[PDB]
Structures are given as C-alpha cells and as structure tokens.
Amino acid sequence: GSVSKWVRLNVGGTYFLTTRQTLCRDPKSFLYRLCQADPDLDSDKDETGAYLIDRDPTYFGPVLNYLRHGKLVINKDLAEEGVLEEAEFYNITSLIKLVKDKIRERDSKTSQVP
Amino acid sequence: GSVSKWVRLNVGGTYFLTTRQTLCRDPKSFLYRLCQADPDLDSDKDETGAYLIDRDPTYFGPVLNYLRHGKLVINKDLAEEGVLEEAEFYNITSLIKLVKDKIRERDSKTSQVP
Amino acid sequence: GSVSKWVRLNVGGTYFLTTRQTLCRDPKSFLYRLCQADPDLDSDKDETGAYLIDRDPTYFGPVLNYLRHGKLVINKDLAEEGVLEEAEFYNITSLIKLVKDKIRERDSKTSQVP
Amino acid sequence: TMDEKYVNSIWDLLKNAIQEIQRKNNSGLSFEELYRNAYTMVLHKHGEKLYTGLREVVTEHLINKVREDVLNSLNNNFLQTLNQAWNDHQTAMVMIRDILMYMDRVYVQQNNVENVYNLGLIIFRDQVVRYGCIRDHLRQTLLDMIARERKGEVVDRGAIRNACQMLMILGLEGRSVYEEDFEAPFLEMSAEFFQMESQKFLAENSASVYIKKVEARINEEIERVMHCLDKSTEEPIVKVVERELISKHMKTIVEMENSGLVH
C-alpha cells in the first residue's frame, strides 16, 4: 500500500484508530508530529504498525473528539482536571483554553453561595 | 537490547500500559521494584509478558496518572477514601499525603457546621 | 500449572482477577469455597477457566476490596444497600457486620433533625 | 474483636520465601505475591509479629549456616569466605527490604525500631562478624596479611580492601564498627612497627636518607590507605606516622652523627 490515511495510535493500551486530518487540526499539537512520515519515529507496534503513546486512554476521548469537531465533549464520569492535564501533554492550545474555561465555570459556580 | 521501555500492568485483570520512567517518580514505590529486571520478578509474568498484579484495576487510575503528570486524577464518582488504600499499597509516599489532605479537604465542606 | 494463585472470576459479566489469598481471608466466605481445588465445583468458561458467578459485577468491587485490603470502599454511585445484599451472598460475616453500620450511619445522619 | 490462624498461613509462605532466597534459587518465587503477603501482615495490625518474625528468620540462617562456613573457612580462604558471605547476605537483604517495604514505612516509623536493612546488617554484625572467634581471627588474619605486605609479599590488597569496605558499611552511619574492630588496633600496631623501623634506619644511614625513607613511607602508607584500606583512615595513620618516625626523633634528626641540621 502506498500509504494509510488511517493511522492506529496506541494510547495507554487502548487502540484509537483515526485519520491524519483528524490529527492535523492544530499546527502545534503533539499528535501533529506523529503524522509526519520523516524518519524520526520508532514507536510503531510493528505487528500492525500502531504508534505507541504512553498516556491515559480514558481522557483521550475529548482530545480526539475535539480534534474532529472542535467542541469539548465529555463523559461526565471523567475528571475535569484530568482532561486539562491530558490535553496539556498533547499541546492542543485552543482546547486547553476551553477546558480552563470549563473548570473556571465549574468551580466559579461551585465557588458561590447566596 | 533484549529489554523494553514499556510495561503492561495487568492490574485487576485490566491492562494498563505505561513506560518504565513513568513509574520511577518514587523509587521506594512498589511499582519501581516491578519496573526493574531484578532476580525476584520473573515469576510474576503473563503469557503476553504483562506483569500480573492483584489489586483494584479501577482505583489504579489516579495512582498511575500521578506517576505520569504528578497530579491526582479522581474520576468524580470514585471515593477519595478508596484510592488512599490503593495508594498505600503501591508506596507512593507523597501521593499518600495529598490524598489524605483531600480526604481532610472534603470534610472541610462535608463535616462543616453551617 | 497444576495450581495458579490467581483466580479468574466472571462475576455476572465483568471479569475480576484476584489472588487466592485475597478470597481466602475468612474461610466461611462463599468466595473461599470457590477457591478450593476439591471436585465439587465445575462451573467455568471452558476456554478461559474463569469461575462463573452470577451476581452484579458492579457491587462486587466493594466485596472484593474488603477481601483485598480489609475496608469498605464504595463508589458514590454504587448503592450501599446493593453491596450489603451483595455481601450477604458471599457470607463474609465481617463485611455485612460493617455495611449495616454505614447504612445506619448514612440514614441517621440524613434524617437527623438538629 | 477476633483472631485467626490464617495469619500463620501467609506467614509460613512469607517465611518459606525468605529461606529460598537465602537458598539462592529464586525460580518460582514472585515479588508481586510476597509484597502483598507482607502488606496483609502489616495491614491486619501484625507489624510487631511480622517485625519479630523477620529478626528470627534471618538470624537462624546466619548462625546455623553462614557462621558455620566462616568457622569452616578459618584456615582455608577465610577472607574469601567472609566476603562471599556478606556479598550474598547483601543480595538476600535487599530482597527482604523489597518484600517488606510497607512494613519498612508504617511500623518502623511509628514504633521507632530499626529499619529492615539496618536489621539485616546488624544481625550480620552481632551474630557472625563481631562474634569472638571470627571477630578476632578476622582481625588477626588481616593484620597477618598487611604486615607481610609490608615485608614485600605480593598480597591480594583487594581482599583486604573488600573486608575493610565490608566493615565500614557494617557500621551503618558511623565509622565506629570499623574503628572498634580494625582501625584502632591497626593504628597502634603500626606505631610499634613504625617505632621499630624508625630506630632501625637511624642506625643504618644519616638524616637525609632517613628523611627520604620517611617521606616515601609517608607516601607509601597513604597509598595503601587509598588502595588497600578505607580512604577515611589516611589522617589517623598520618598522625601516627608523623608522631613515631618524626616527632619522636626530632632532636636526633637535628644532630645526626657528623650530620643533622647543625651540619
């Protein structure tokens, strides 16, 4: 095959299949560097070629979802701060702003009592 | 090099994937001993090579992520009193401390007198 | 191997992997009776050899946690009554001895008029 | 409240493990299992029971096995054996420390008893190393080898050094255990050796050659301290060296026969 527009990440064990354009939404993001076909990459699980990314899969959801539709979608059971740290690692600036607002809204309301 | 930098913790039946240097935040930690190639580890291994660990697979999340980004990630539903006794087992002394305060922190609002 | 210190529980749909010693904390426990190698028990998935226990996997966590670290850890969503009856099934007379108090403690605190 | 015979069941497996490590066949033993076992012991309010059981289980092996070889090696590769024992004992005790880490944290810091590795070396210190016949035979054996080295004999300096390191670590955070057993006997022993040599060469040559030997000896002894003894012994020996060869013979050196500072 010439190339696979589909790429198979491994994020803390959980395989997250996705497409380059999903990963190329932000010029300065960690995930963007993975997309490069330059020789600087050695975490391919050669049994299938899945690149390995050692971090928590559970919070990888909102990161990947935002990386497709640009809104902070959440499963309530996930931690508010955990997504802040999780994206922080991946370097999606626009998102980590949004969550920092999400936390701000969460606590600010939580910080008030009539 | 006949050795890898990524380990598979089969905690509580769940597969957690993480990299050696991730676990070495506290060398006095249970995991740091697991992280080595000592003469007292070969027995605890799976057919896959994953290390077979026999503690809770769900409260392990805050413990492992703290070893990743030095902050507690308590999925909101989980109980603060529950990770503490998962923390104790792994011997993350500093982590044991901040949860205990969190437990104490919770009572500031829950054990309050209006 | 003729024996394996790890027992594989299929507790109503959600797998649990735990050590024989953890289940054998007090032999009266119905869980202990499962661990024995005697010929009475034969219920397990043929391929994987996991005991088929037909009970709520969700509420089993607090039951197994007590049998792992001797305390009652219950996620905020799990009903205390649910573990109570769940605990009653396995016959860990100590756990049920505890749950009713928390149950009573829970209710007494709530309905308490100043 | 209640108690269970179940505590012993895990204790036996934990005990059974410790022997096997000391038997030097780890195959089959698993760290994951043991740490949790130890965890269960300390968790059920049995730290004192676990703490005591540790002290015994190691102690028996040292006195029943380790000491026996050291006694058996008194006149056959002794230094090799005693080093070998403490090398292996180190290997075993790190495992013991690794299996008891939790107890090493909760019970030790709460009850003010010595930590696991302190106990591991201490029992090796009280029961085998500082045991009279071994202790003195050890001291004599080393002193036998060093003097012969001073007598031009090719000697395994590393063997002596290793034992010197062995003793140093056996002293925990202080030099005392090294000072009590080897250093102080060594320093005063060398004074008699230095004292005898000083008057020997005073009757063999004049001041300049006497000085030349003294400076070379000063360098020679220090070099041995660097390569055959602990490096912390240097200043002690130098004060002894200076006091015996030089300080005792000052007025002579000033006034040697047809020589001296006057001449």
Beta strands in chain C (DSSP E): 6-11, 14-19, 51-53
Backbone angles phi, psi at D76, to 5 degrees: -155, 100
Asked if the Cβ–Cβ distance from B73 to A54 is below 8 Å, we say no
Q: Which residues in chain B are contacts of A76 at CB distance < 8 A?
A: 76
Return the HEC string of D99-121: HCHHHHHHHHHHHCCCCHHHHHH
Output the six-digit token pair for A64.
Answer: 């990947």
Residue of C111, C90, C87 lying closest to C99 (CA atoms)? C87
- Check: CB of residue A32 under 8 Å from CB of residue A23: yes
Q: Is C11 helix (H, G, I), strand (E, B) or coil?
A: strand
What single-letter DSSP state applies at residue A96?
H
Nearest-Cα distance to chain D for B77, in Å, is 26
Angle between helices D234-241 and D184-202 (to 10 degrees): 30
**Angle in degrees, CA B12, B14, B18, rounded to 5:** 110
Residues 6+ apart with CB under 8 A from B69: A85, A88, A89
Cβ count near A73 (within 10 Å) = 11
A35 to chain B, closest Cα gap in Å: 22
Closest CA to C21 of D137, D34, B73, D187: D34
- Smallest Cα–Cα separation from D51: which of D1, D14, D3? D14
The helix (run of H) or strand (run of E) holding residue C99 is helix C93-111
Q: B96 is written with which tokens?
A: 């044991």
Amino acid identity at D66: V
- Which residues are registered as beta bridge partners of C8? C17
To 10 degrees, what angle do helices D6-23 and D31-43 make?
A: 140
- Distance CA(C10)–CA(A33), nearest Å, equals 42
Among B5, B6, B20, B69, the residue to mutate for chain A (most A Cβ within 10 A): B69
Distance CA(B55)–CA(B13), nearest Å, equals 9
Hey, what are D183's tokens? 């250093």
Query: Distance between CA D46 and CA D53 in Å, rounded?
Result: 10
Yes or no: say if B86 and B60 are a contact pair by the CB < 8 Å rule: yes
Distance of CA D180 to the CA centre of its chain: 11
Residue B51's contacts (CB-CB under 8 Å, 6 or more residues apart) are: B7, B8, B9, B10, B34, B41, B44, B45, D32
With CA atoms as reference, report the closest residue to D165 among D115, D258, D90.
Answer: D90
> This structure's resolution (angstroms)?
3.6
Closest CA to D99 of D27, D50, D66: D50
Partners of B51 on chain D (C-beta within 8 Å) are: 32
Work out the burial of residue D251: count CB atoms within 10 Å of its CB; fewer than 13 is exposed, 13-18 middle, 19 or more buried.
exposed
Largest CA distance in chain D: 94
Question: C13: which residues sit within 8 A by CB, 6+ positions away?
Answer: C57
Q: Residue D37: which of C21, C24, C70 has the nearest Cβ?
A: C21
**Interchain CB distance below 8 Å, B18 and A54:** yes
Nearest to B39 by CA among D20, D36, C21: D20
Which of C15, C68, C75 shows the shortest C-beta gap to B79?
C75
Cα(C63)–Cα(C65) distance, rounded to whole angstroms?
Answer: 6
CA distance C83 to C65: 11
Minimum distance, in Å, between the CA of residue C25 and any CA atom of chain B? 15
Residues 6-45 of B with CB under 8 A from D: 28, 30, 33-34, 38-44
Strand-pairing partners, residue A7, are A18
Nearest-by-Cβ selection for B79 from C15, C68, C74: C74
- How many CB atoms neighbour CB D185 within 10 A? 16
In whole angstroms, what is the distance from residue D190 CA to residue C1 CA? 63
Residue C37 CB burial class (10 angstroms; 0-12, 13-18, ≥19): exposed
Chain C: partners with 3+ C-beta pairs within 8 Å: B, D
How far from chain centre, in Å, is Cα D240?
Answer: 23
**Virtual torsion, Cα C54, C60, C63, C66, nearest 10 deg:** 140
Residue of chain D with shortest Cα separation from C24: D6
Residues of chain B contacting C3 with CB distance shorter than 8 Å: none
Cα C99 to chain centroid distance, Å, stands at 13
User: Is the Cβ–Cβ distance between D244 and D194 less than 8 Å?
Assistant: yes
For residues C30 and C98, the answer to whether their CB atoms sit within 8 Å is: no
**Chains B, D in contact: 3+ Cβ pairs under 8 A?**
yes
CB contact under 8 A, D10 and C21: yes
Tell me how far apart the alpha carbons of residues D259 and D208 are, in angstroms, rounded to a whole number: 9
**At which residue do the structure tokens 């300049």 appear?**
D208
D181: burial class by Cβ within 10 Å (0-12, 13-18, 19+)? buried
Dihedral (C-alpha) D67, D71, D74, D78: value to the nearest 10 degrees? Answer: -20
Torsion, CA A83, CA A85, CA A86, CA A88, rounded to 10: 120
Dihedral sign, Cα of residue A103, residue A104, residue A109, residue A111: positive
Look up residue B42 and give its two tokens.
């070969």
Please tell me chain C's helix, strand, coil percentages from 3-state DSSP, rounded to the nearest 5: 45, 15, 40
**Residue with tokens 């790890």, as numbered in its chain:** C6
The rounded distance, in Å, linking the Cα atoms of B65 and B9 is 13
| Cβ-contact D133, D187 below 8 angstroms | no
Mutate: best of B9, B85, B106, B112, partner C, most C CBs <10 A: B85
> Are D27 and B43 in contact (CB < 8 Å)?
yes
Residue type present at position D44: H
Do residues C32 and C18 make contact, with C-beta atoms less than 8 angstroms apart?
A: no
Find the length of chain C. 114
Q: Write out chain B residues lying below 8 Å of A96, CB-based.
A: none
Which of D12, D32, D40, D45 to probe by mutation at the C interface, max C CB count within 10 Å?
D40
Q: D35 vs B30: CB contact, 8 Å cut-off?
A: yes
**Amino acid in the structure at residue B2:** S
The count of other CB atoms within 10 Å of the CB of residue D24 is: 10
What sign results for the dihedral spanned by CA atoms D21, D49, D41, B96? negative
> How big is the CA angle at D182 (ends D148 and D73), to the nearest 5 degrees?
70
Alpha helices in chain D (DSSP H): 6-23, 31-43, 47-61, 67-72, 78-99, 101-111, 116-124, 132-150, 157-170, 176-178, 184-202, 207-227, 234-241, 250-254
Distance CA B38, CA B32 (A): 11
Contact residues for B28 (Cβ-Cβ < 8 A; gap 6+): B91, B93, D101, D105
